[PDB]
Symmetry: C3
Subunit: 428 residues, 3 copies
Amino acid sequence: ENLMQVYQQARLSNPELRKSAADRDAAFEKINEARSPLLPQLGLGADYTYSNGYRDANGINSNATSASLQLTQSIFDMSKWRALTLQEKAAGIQDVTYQTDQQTLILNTATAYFNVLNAIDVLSYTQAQKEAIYRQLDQTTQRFNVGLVAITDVQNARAQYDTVLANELTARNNLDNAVEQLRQITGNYYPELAALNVENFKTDKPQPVNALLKEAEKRNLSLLQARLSQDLAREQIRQAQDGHLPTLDLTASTGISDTSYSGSKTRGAAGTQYDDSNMGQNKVGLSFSLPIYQGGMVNSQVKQAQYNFVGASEQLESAHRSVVQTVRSSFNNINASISSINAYKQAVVSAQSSLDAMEAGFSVGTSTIVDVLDATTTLYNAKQELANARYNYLINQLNIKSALGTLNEQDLLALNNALSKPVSTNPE
Amino acid sequence: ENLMQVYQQARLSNPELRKSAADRDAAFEKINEARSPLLPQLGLGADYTYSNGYRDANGINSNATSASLQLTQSIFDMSKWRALTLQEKAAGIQDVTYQTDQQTLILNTATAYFNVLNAIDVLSYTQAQKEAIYRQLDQTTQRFNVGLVAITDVQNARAQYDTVLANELTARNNLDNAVEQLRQITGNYYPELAALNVENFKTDKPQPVNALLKEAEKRNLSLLQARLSQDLAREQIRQAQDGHLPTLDLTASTGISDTSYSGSKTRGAAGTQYDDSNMGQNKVGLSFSLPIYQGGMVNSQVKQAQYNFVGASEQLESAHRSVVQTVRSSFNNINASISSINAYKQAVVSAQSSLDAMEAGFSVGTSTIVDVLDATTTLYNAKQELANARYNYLINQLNIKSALGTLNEQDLLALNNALSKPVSTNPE
Amino acid sequence: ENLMQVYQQARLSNPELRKSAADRDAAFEKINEARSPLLPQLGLGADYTYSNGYRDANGINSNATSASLQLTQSIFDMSKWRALTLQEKAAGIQDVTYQTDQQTLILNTATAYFNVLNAIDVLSYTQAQKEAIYRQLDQTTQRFNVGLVAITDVQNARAQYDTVLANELTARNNLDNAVEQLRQITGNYYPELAALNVENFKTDKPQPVNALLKEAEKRNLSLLQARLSQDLAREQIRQAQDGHLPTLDLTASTGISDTSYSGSKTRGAAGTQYDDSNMGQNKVGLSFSLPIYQGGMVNSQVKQAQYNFVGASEQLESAHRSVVQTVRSSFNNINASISSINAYKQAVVSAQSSLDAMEAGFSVGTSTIVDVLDATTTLYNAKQELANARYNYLINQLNIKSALGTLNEQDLLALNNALSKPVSTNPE
Ligand SMILES: CCCCCCCCCCCCO[C@@H]1O[C@H](CO)[C@@H](O[C@H]2O[C@H](CO)[C@@H](O)[C@H](O)[C@H]2O)[C@H](O)[C@H]1O
Ligand SMILES: [Cl-]
Ligand SMILES: [Cl-]
Ligand SMILES: [Cl-]
């Protein structure tokens, strides 16, 4: 399949991104658990108790039973509103983290995809290098037979074909592990992909660096998260400061008490005290609580929260600095990648006419086969180095979007258009 | 010493593995602390108090003294049985983690051991390469004297010996740091080891990949741990759900109260109220508590626990995917390693007869010393590349067992048998 | 600017080190929050309550109001002293961590600085290599015109200049990203730096290894922290053991109760019970609490704390082992670095006279231009490899200081003296 189709099938299955989602999903649900203390708490208690008097109570015994429907309600507790506020903020943070992890699926799928396309290019060039050496070995072994080439030109040539044989070997390996890379990320094995359409390919220059930098400062997810986090440390300072405020709660019960006495000093007290009591109370009440001095625990908590804010801020500076260097390095690299595709584009042309020369030269006395092998080897190196450099440009366009924070599905859709030929991932 | 003896000495001292053990030891003991709330709690409290009445109590004062032997007992508290259950599970997890760390000691000891054997092979070859160039330099300097070799053949040859001199230098360094690696891991320094017996060496083909894969899915420790962890997230969902259940505890005291009054309105009240009281109560009782509505805190806690379970599951998928690619890549690599030992086995033969030729050639005009140097350099490269590839196969056999989850002492015992010659780790 | 001036400007702005500082600052302030429970806690509570009787209380109603100024004071609570003790210890640990991070700013600033100096050296050599090939190409293209040089000597020579052209390209990239590295760390961009004064340069042999090792065992920060941490685990064992001790607190209130009754069975009870009560109590009291059996929670907690200590100890052994290998490897490396600056110092001399020869040789028939290019290429490689090796020696001097735990500003001040020539970071 093409880039799109691979990516899309990975979107639905990546246990890396699916976990990041379950983390986002929990953090948002946990807002609910944070809101809960601002709502009515409603419990039910029943307490059986048997007392047995001794000393000045030797002979007074009781079997008591109570039950109640208790209700609590926060009426003014700033600290509980703050927790709600923080859980919202943490959830927002988790969402930027998901946003970031979404992008990482894109960059990682593209990368593995091209790393396969390359493992393929490398193989097929290494096979063409092998095959080309064989034919040059069978003209250097049908000219040695005829006397006009030294035996050490054939021992060298055979030792050199044996190397391209061992190279073809650790080339498929590289390829095979590449599709294993792709499977882990993607969940699948592909019999064929779709390689970079070679003639229909031009590099597009990058936007000025100062524009990319400015766009990144508005939308780069690492930066947006450092900001949300500084925001969290500041709300956390208020939280420390809430421990100075007073709290007003409401309570309301409906209880039922059923005591009954026994023993000896109950057998004629006749004060109708030790007579069965059957109470029932409806209550509603307000507790007010004000902290006044707590060993200075509140102030130390506040100071801590403030250093935490400095730290959150330093972390933020670290973030701009990272976005700066990432956005620049990333611009720098796409430029060096364009100027590289150009140089290798020409070194292939050179390596080609340089080979063509020493094939004519060798079959007619002029230059050795060890002139023709090198010139051949040299060709296929520029051949590889080129197609490799192309892929890096493609992946470097994607890094620029990541550093920007805009890396999305469309960046993949466009890149899809620039490849077409279905290539096998398991060449015979 | 041999592989075995090194490993074994490291088993007894590795502070990496010894810590992992202390972690396992603590998690298991912590089961005890988790069981404790299901047992009887037994405290002792005595409270002296002095009251001093004012307002409608101006003149009523009291000095009271109480003490009690309190006892609590969980009778039905599902949440406390759950914690016990979870600490058992966490202990199990810690033990799979120790199991994993045990293996890592094995892979790490073997790796360092061969990294030394290689630093040694590389040195001794680099010494033989040095020594061989010296003798070829003293035949090219006893033929230059006699006129029939250009001075630039000797300037080239001396500049080239100078390089093998600098190579011998940054070869012994590599070696020395390798024994430092080994010491950190192992606690010791070895004057000699035991290198890979070179003639008594063949490669053994690996088991089919589909068999390894199937064996790994049953025993691979990383996988077993993802599973124990999914299990934990599920028990954790039940824990969230326990917050709907009621709790029944028992309590039992034996108190003693000693109040005594004073002030002015005690000096003739003659109601025998403000008379010294001396109580003593034996109690036993049952508290029952049922939550009814808690702001929906219990449900949000349950939903959270559920997303955690989704995540624990995605994590598990991630684990299969890792076991797949590890087991394949690892199979792939041992194969490419066998086919590699073969190719280098032959390139050494080639490089050898190719040298032999150009030594005869150079001492009789035919080929330069710059033909003889390269051919020599080339040999020693195959010489190294070979013994190096051998070690990689050995270490790759061990990676399969790790991916399998079976890496153990016997895998080392067998590998021990395939080495014998005691080699110095500090060559003069 | 020079090394000093860069470093110093980074000291004032590094958000990596400024964060580490905010972490240290908080840990120390948090001692305050740990001391607080040992001080007086002073609150204020007022509780309005309305009761409404039913059953044996049908017709008894009350509106009650209370307020109090409560005070608590730990009189003997070992656990609270221990917390204070641990927070002190944690703060100490955070400070060793800051000490470590301080050093890392130094090593990291120096490294980036020299990595720029090197990206510069490499560029300027790559430019001199380019420029030298051009002139040799324009004598091989004004001798081909005159017939006595094959065309394949010019196709080879142009393909080889094209390579140094592409090398110059991915050289000024390397450089540009190096200053980006430097900016992230340092906060600035420098138009010029100051490179290693090349003639005024000698290597200084290192102190014997056994001395460095002994010095490191006394002052290496990683080791000091492992020790401080072992100390924490042991204090943590005492903390576990404190759960067996009894606790004695003091309390003091000044309350005010204002009950008032209503309903029907209050309308003539005439027992002056349901008459407005107006209490007021001054209290002072001592609570004593002794744990006796807590399900063996205290003992399991202690055993756990003890395994933690074993782990903290194993961790410590891991630390010596790390300091050993770091101090040795680091000594080893500076020596191989000296012996390296020497070998490359000579290979440049060789590569120079070897070039000089084959420039005379080629302009007068003797050796090809493909003899003159290689010999040239070879010179500039030793030229680079040399200046590169020099920097590594500088940075390796700094690693010894880190492994020692003495890396400080003076180590930089001295290194500053050994450079002087202001070099541009943006060569045209
Ligand atoms: C003689 C040496 C003894 C050394 C240790 C002394 C400790 C005190 C004795 C405690 C008795 C053991 O308690 C026993 O342990 C296992 C572990 O839960 C329980 O087994 C159970 O465990 C978990 C709950 O905890 C459940 O999910 C499980 O399905 C269930 O089988 C038994 O229900 C219980 O009866
Ligand atoms: Cl306070
Ligand atoms: Cl609820
Ligand atoms: Cl106990």
